[PDB]
């Protein structure tokens, strides 16, 4: 009678989903980009004096796997819907793709809005690239408003690179799943 | 293994991705198979088709109409996800002789857009659904249908479908305009596409009362200060429509059409852009131009 929790990670390609999963479980940041098809990892975790098995499911961000990805969805307890804070386009896809898609396949399943790559929010080289394309990074406030409108449990952000906010992301996911 | 290469087909994978999956230990395939079995779809195609027919039924008082359509956007979003992420067979059923999904979808889009496009009751009703995201979501549905080879073909052969897609260029959301242009560009690139596109833009001109065809396309493209993606999609589409034709004399006539609408003068300023995505489209156009 070991208790189980299934957490599934989604969002645009190259947003950071695999790094954040690997940095959190393993404490190392993987330097080579290798696009995901599907993967899963498992971890033991204690909340309120009780152990749970936390299942973690990595998914493909790219559209070509659009009919493969929903096989990862059944029995999901909590979703992490991720976007990069330095990619407005990935932010937009949150509303247009990712939230509609998990709500359709898994009604009544909580999700968190996860801003990723926050370390890059102050990198001038990054600010410069967005600037040439008439863009800026996403501010916490802006993301928080979207999280409200789409009925996310809450908004959280992290860097898989610095591990800042990383633990708290998963803390929040667990709590969201047991509420 | 063979209960796998059938699950493989249902996923509409490009050959390079299918090949990659194929070199998978016979164990993994099994896990994939188990995953499919575990997987159930939400609704059959006629669920969504019936709702759309309900929205279109003029025998309904305004009351039930307003109440029926209060979830229209939600229903369209569920149809779009179904079209885009269910097994490809779900799409075939939607498109089939019993269902005629493509007809109802095109019909609803036309209705959603009727107001924007310029019986007083249906004009009133349309205005109800024309300020929501319905149009945009219908365009997304068409996009999903078009990623399926057979579905792409039905869109081409359809009497109204690309006509209506072109009409959506009038939608005030630049994100919507971009998507339309991407769809229009894709159709234009396949054999027989160019004629369908010109015919669609002739139809656009008449219904919208333009002086010359592409008039409003150019308006929107000139008028837009801020959305790089829409500008990228506009430039790309223009370059395909003038420069992909077989007849060189036709190419130059097409080129001058846009010249008479001030593209050349506009690209004069625009070529100094900072955006590298837009830069490449403009360059491609300039490289293709005749003297
Ligand atoms: N600076 C910074 N870079 C990051 C961070 N997380 C990921 N990256 C970089 O982002 C790129 C892609 O990350 P990855 O996790 O592979 O993305 P993904 O979301 O799984 N994409 P896919 O859907 O294809 O699997 C890699 O260059 C990785 O190095 C971060 O927190 N900070
Ligand atoms: Mg990856």
By C-alpha distance, which of B189, B259, B168 is closest to B218?
B259
CATH number for the B159-291 domain, one of 3.40.640.10, 3.40.50.150, 1.25.10.10, 3.40.630.30? 1.25.10.10
DSSP code string of B208-265 = HT-SSTTHHHHHHHHH-SS-HHHHHHHHHHHHHHHHS-S-HHHHHHHHHHHHHTTHHH
Integer angstrom CA distances of residue A172 from A21, A113, A161, A168, B90: 15, 11, 19, 6, 36
d(C-alpha B38, C-alpha A73), whole Å? 10
d(C-alpha B53, C-alpha A120), whole Å? 49
Length of chain B: 291
**Contact list, B81 vs chain A (CB under 8 Å):** 100-101, 104-105
d(C-alpha A50, C-alpha A30), whole Å? 31
Residues 6 or more apart from B90 whose CB is under 8 A from it? B41, B45, B82, B83
Tokens (6 digits) for B48: 């969504």
Tokens (6 digits) for B189: 């690139």
* Among the partner residues B11, B77, B274, nearest to A132 by beta-carbon distance: B274
d(C-alpha A71, C-alpha A67), whole Å? 8
Other beta carbons within 10 Å of B160: 16
* Ligand 1 contact via A117 beta carbon (within 6 Å): yes
**Contact list, B19 vs chain A (CB under 8 Å):** none
d(C-alpha B136, C-alpha B155), whole Å? 17
Residue of A18, A25, A115, A126 best suited for mutating to test ligand 1, as the one with most atoms within 8 Å of CB:
A18
d(C-alpha B249, C-alpha B188), whole Å? 18
A113 with A155: CB under 8 angstroms?
Answer: yes
* Ligand 1 contact via A18 beta carbon (within 6 Å): yes
d(C-alpha A11, C-alpha A82), whole Å? 5
Q: Which helix (H) or strand (E) holds B218?
A: helix B215-223
The approach used to solve this structure was: X-ray
Q: DSSP letter for A98, please.
A: I
Strand partners, A113: A81, A155
What dihedral angle (degrees, nearest 10) is formed by the CA atoms of B219, B225, B227, B231?
50
Residues 6 or more apart from B245 whose CB is under 8 A from it? B194, B251, B254
Is A18 annotated for ligand binding?
yes
Residue of A8, A80, A160 best suited for mutating to test ligand 1, as the one with most atoms within 8 Å of CB:
A160
Residue A3 C-alpha from the chain's centroid: 23
> Which residue's entry shows tokens 């593209």?
B263
> Which residue's entry shows tokens 């991720």?
A82
Strand intervals (E) in B102-232: none
d(C-alpha B44, C-alpha B235), whole Å? 39
Strand partners, A43: A54
Q: DSSP letter for A59, please.
A: E
> What residues does each domain of chain B span?
1-40, 43-158, 159-291
Mark out the alpha helices in chain A (DSSP H runs): 17-26, 88-93, 99-105, 124-132, 140-149, 166-178
State the CATH number of the domain containing residue A126. Answer: 3.40.50.300
Mark out the alpha helices in B147-192 (DSSP H runs): 149-157, 161-167, 174-189
d(C-alpha B16, C-alpha B93), whole Å? 26
The number of the ligand nearest the C-alpha atom of A37 reads 1
* Ligand 1 contact via A14 beta carbon (within 6 Å): yes
User: Resolution of this PDB entry, in A?
Assistant: 2.5
Tokens (6 digits) for A101: 């898609």
Q: DSSP letter for B99, please.
A: T
Strand partners, A103: none
Strand partners, A81: A10, A113
Count of the separate structural domains present in chain A: 1
* Angstroms from A176 CA to nearest CA on chain B: 24
Tokens (6 digits) for B57: 């039924």
Q: Is A55 exposed, middle or buried (CB count within 10 Å of its CB: 0-12, 13-18, 19+)?
A: middle
Q: Which residue of B has its CA nearest to A75?
A: B38
Query: What residue numbers bound the domain in which A37 lies?
Result: 1-179
d(C-alpha B135, C-alpha B112), whole Å? 6
Strand partners, A6: A55
B260 with B205: CB under 8 angstroms?
Answer: no
By C-alpha distance, which of B168, B153, B30 is closest to B91?
B153
Strand partners, A115: A83, A157
Three-state DSSP at B102 gives helix
Q: How far apart are the first and last CA of chain B?
A: 59
What dihedral angle (degrees, nearest 10) is formed by the CA atoms of B58, B63, B64, B65?
50
Residue A43 C-alpha from the chain's centroid: 17
User: Is B39 in contact with A70 (Cβ distance < 8 A)?
Assistant: yes
d(C-alpha B231, C-alpha A124), whole Å? 25
| Tally: H helices and E strands in chain B | 18, 0
Is A116 annotated for ligand binding?
yes
B121 with B63: CB under 8 angstroms?
Answer: no
**Contact list, B20 vs chain A (CB under 8 Å):** 37
A119 with A170: CB under 8 angstroms?
Answer: no
């Amino acid at each position: 009678a070991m208790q189980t929790i299934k957490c599934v990670v989604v969002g645009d390609g190259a947003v950071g989903k695999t790094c954040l999963l690997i940095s959190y479980t393993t404490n190392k940041f993987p330097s080579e980009y290798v696009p995901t098809v599907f993967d899963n990892y498992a971890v033991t975790v204690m909340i309120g004096g009780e152990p749970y098995t936390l299942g973690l499911f990595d998914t493909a961000g790219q559209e070509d796997y659009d009919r493969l990805r929903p096989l990862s969805y059944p029995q999901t307890d909590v979703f992490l819907v991720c976007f990069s804070v330095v990619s407005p386009s990935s932010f937009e896809n949150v509303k247009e793709k990712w939230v509609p898609e998990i709500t359709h396949h898994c009604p009544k399943t909580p999700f968190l809005l996860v801003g990723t790559q926050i370390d890059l929010r102050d990198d001038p080289s990054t600010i410069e690239k967005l600037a040439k394309n008439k863009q800026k990074p996403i501010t916490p406030e802006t993301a928080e408003k979207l999280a409200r409108d789409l009925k996310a449990v809450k908004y959280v952000e992290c860097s898989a690179l610095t591990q800042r906010g990383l633990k708290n992301v998963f803390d929040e996911a667990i709590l969201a799943a047991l509420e | 293994e063979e209960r796998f290469a059938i699950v493989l087909n249902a996923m509409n994978l490009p050959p390079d991705k299918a090949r990659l999956l194929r070199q998978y230990d016979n164990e993994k395939k099994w896990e994939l198979i188990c995953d499919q079995e575990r997987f159930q779809v939400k609704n059959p195609p006629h669920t969504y088709i019936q709702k759309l027919k309900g929205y279109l039924d003029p025998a309904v008082t305004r009351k039930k109409f307003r109440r029926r359509v209060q979830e229209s956007t939600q229903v369209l979003r569920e149809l779009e996800i179904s079209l885009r992420t269910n097994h490809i067979g779900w799409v075939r059923e939607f498109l089939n002789e019993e269902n005629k999904g493509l007809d109802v979808l095109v019909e609803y889009l036309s209705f959603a857009q009727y107001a924007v496009t310029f019986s007083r009751r249906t004009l009133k009703n349309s205005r109800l659904v024309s300020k929501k995201d319905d149009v945009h979501v219908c365009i997304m549905c068409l996009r999903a249908i078009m990623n399926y080879q057979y579905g792409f073909n039905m869109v081409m052969s359809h009497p109204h479908a690309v006509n209506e897609i072109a009409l959506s260029l009038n939608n005030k959301n630049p994100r919507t305009k971009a998507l339309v242009l991407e769809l229009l560009a894709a159709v234009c690139l396949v054999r027989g596409g160019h004629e369908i596109i010109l015919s669609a833009f002739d139809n656009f001109k008449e219904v919208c009362g333009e002086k010359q065809r592409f008039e409003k396309l150019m308006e929107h493209f000139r008028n837009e200060d801020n959305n790089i993606d829409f500008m990228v999609a506009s430039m790309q589409f223009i370059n395909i429509v003038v420069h992909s034709v077989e007849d060189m004399n036709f190419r130059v006539h097409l080129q001058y059409e846009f010249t008479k609408l001030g593209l050349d003068e506009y690209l004069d300023k625009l070529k100094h852009t900072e955006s590298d995505k837009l830069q490449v489209q403009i360059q491609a156009y300039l490289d293709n131009v005749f003297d």
